[PDB]
Amino acid sequence: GAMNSSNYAELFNNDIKLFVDDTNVYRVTVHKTFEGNVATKAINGCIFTLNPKTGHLFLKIIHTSVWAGQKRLSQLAKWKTAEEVSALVRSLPKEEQPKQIIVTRKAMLDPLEVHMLDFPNIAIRPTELRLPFSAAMSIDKLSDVVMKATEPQMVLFNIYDDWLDRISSYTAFSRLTLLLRALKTNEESAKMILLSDPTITIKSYHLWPSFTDEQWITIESQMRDLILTEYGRKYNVNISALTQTEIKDIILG
Amino acid sequence: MNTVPFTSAPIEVTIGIDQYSFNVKENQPFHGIKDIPIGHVHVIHFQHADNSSMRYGYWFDCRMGNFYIQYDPKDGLYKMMEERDGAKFENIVHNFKERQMMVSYPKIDEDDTWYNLTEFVQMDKIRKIVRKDENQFSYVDSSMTTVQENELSDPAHSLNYTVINFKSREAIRPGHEMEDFLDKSYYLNTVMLQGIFKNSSNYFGELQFAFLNAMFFGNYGSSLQWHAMIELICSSATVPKHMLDKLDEILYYQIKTLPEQYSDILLNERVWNICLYSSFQKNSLHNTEKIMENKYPELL
Numbered sequence A: 001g002a003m004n005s006s007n008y009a010e011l012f013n014n015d016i017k018l019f020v021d022d023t024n025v026y027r028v029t030v031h032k033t034f035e036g037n038v039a040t041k042a043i044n045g046c047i048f049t050l051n052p053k054t055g056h057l058f059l060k061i062i063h064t065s066v067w068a069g070q071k072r073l074s075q076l077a078k079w080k081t082a083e084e085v086s087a088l089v090r091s092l093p094k095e096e097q098p099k100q101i102i103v104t105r106k107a108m109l110d111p112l113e114v115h116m117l118d119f120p121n122i123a124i125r126p127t128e129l130r131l132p133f134s135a136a137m138s139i140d141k142l143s144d145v146v147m148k149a150t151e152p153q154m155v156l157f158n159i160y161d162d163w164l165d166r167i168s169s170y171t172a173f174s175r176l177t178l179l180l181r182a183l184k185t186n187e188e189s190a191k192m193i194l195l196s197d198p199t200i201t202i203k204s205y206h207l208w209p210s211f212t213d214e215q216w217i218t219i220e221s222q223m224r225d226l227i228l229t230e231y232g233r234k235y236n237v238n239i240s241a242l243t244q245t246e247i248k249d250i251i252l253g
Numbered sequence B: 001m002n003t004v005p006f007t008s009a010p011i012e013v014t015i016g017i018d019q020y021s022f023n024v025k026e027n028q029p030f031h032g033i034k035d036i037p038i039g040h041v042h043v044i045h046f047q048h049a050d051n052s053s054m055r056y057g058y059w060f061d062c063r064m065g066n067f068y069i070q071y072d073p074k075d076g077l078y079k080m081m082e083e084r085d086g087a088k089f090e091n092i093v094h095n096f097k098e099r100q101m102m103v104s105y106p107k108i109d110e111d112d113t114w115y116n117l118t119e120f121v122q123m124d125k126i127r128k129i130v131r132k133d134e135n136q137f138s139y140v141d142s143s144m145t146t147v148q149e150n151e152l153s154d155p156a157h158s159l160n161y162t163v164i165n166f167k168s169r170e171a172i173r174p175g176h177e178m179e180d181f182l183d184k185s186y187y188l189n190t191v192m193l194q195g196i197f198k199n200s201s202n203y204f205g206e207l208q209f210a211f212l213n214a215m216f217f218g219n220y221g222s223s224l225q226w227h228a229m230i231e232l233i234c235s236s237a238t239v240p241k242h243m244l245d246k247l248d249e250i251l252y253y254q255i256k257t258l259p260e261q262y263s264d265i266l267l268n269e270r271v272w273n274i275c276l277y278s279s280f281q282k283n284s285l286h287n288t289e290k291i292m293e294n295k296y297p298e299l300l
């Protein structure tokens, strides 16, 4: 069924699974026309398909040419997502195919189920966590490859860099959600936190900086404070009065 | 006009014949139903007074033999039987008529209701849905499950309706996933009409038989089948015009006959609202929309 907090450890078990997020597939800028009407201009997008146990990020770039001459693009985009995920599954060896695919938005359930009819044993499931994968386009290297694409293209990244050499995937997924949530809530400030020390760099083959274990603790604390600071600004709440239990609940969920 | 005599009525029971019904008391001198119109299928159905869980009955066509009802005290139900001795049967019927021991099928001359509900229903098709080849009539009851229900458990006692499943390989062509899911015309016209049913008359006959089993027996799987066959048409952008006009007539008479107090259990809100207000055919069912809005405006 649906994936929620009652089963976080299922994410990191040895059954292959993928999260699919379609929030950046169909992207537009809205602008005025010479006559004063409004029109949209599509820009390149991407499907975010992630194995949460291994960090594998299969980033299918959606080039604006796929929308040419098509109607009802927001609806088409769900079916295009499902078509591309189905094609990825078929392209993988049997032993690498997922046993479950978890969609971040319930509107993806029927499109994906229909495209996966040839795979009756692959469970298609929704989830109840509000996951910030939309902020994937706030990661500079992913945004760059998407915007530069001149044709459909699939690109691979480890979204965990080399973190699994030192931490478990549960902690890595927790770290990723805190980072992405921070980038979604205040992108400028989150990037300042991540990049304000010139001596800590991003390896050519990585997405995030090469922090030591102690530096990651500091970074994670600064991301929580940012999330808490934006919370207080949004809701006109004085954050000084908040207890540790109150702060944990706000950031979690 | 034909006759279904009863040997007797040893248990108190509500007897249905098509859309009509009447109460028989325990050991009342009741000996059957006369003046049954030739040319249509009919259904004779039962609900026992002391146990309303017993809802069951028999589809039959008097052109295919001489049928009678006899209570079986071992199996505890009224059973349809065929009499092969024609002179014996005529002799029995004449004595019962002479003694006025039979109710008359109470049809009004203006009234085309039964024709309108059974226009496309044939006994030969009923006997393929309800498999019991040694009899020329077909038993149905409230509890019988459909082949589809059993996939998701005695096979000999199933309703073999045509399986319709919108998220199935049968319904969706590879390479046309979005097209076929959002516009079911392929599945309706090529898979179902051309391929399985052969023509719209056979499709409508199964739809009408499913509705009647839903209403007369409180059969849930039949109700599912009726709604699925409606939704398949309404969710197709391309349907022959004569089929849409006939569907409108079929549904109008079904909604007209439904007991107002069973509407909450025989009508699926999602399907009807989708069909009448969102589907491709939302503006093609004028008579059905009018009766639904005036009779059951709450469901919508």
Ligand SMILES: COC(=O)CN(C(=O)c1ccsc1)C(C)C
Residues within 6 Å of the ligand: A055, A056, A057, A058, A156, A157, A158
């Ligand atoms: C880019 O090259 C890869 O092999 C991708 N990587 C993966 O973790 C991966 C493996 C399967 S799908 C994604 C690393 C970045 C080496």
Ligand SMILES: COC(=O)CN(C(=O)c1ccsc1)C(C)C
Residues within 6 Å of the ligand: A008, A129, A170, A171, A173, A174, A175, A177, A178, A179, A181, A251, A252, A253
């Ligand atoms: C492996 O478990 C988790 O990752 C649980 N979560 C967090 O730890 C979290 C939440 C916001 S910032 C960090 C999320 C609910 C997914």
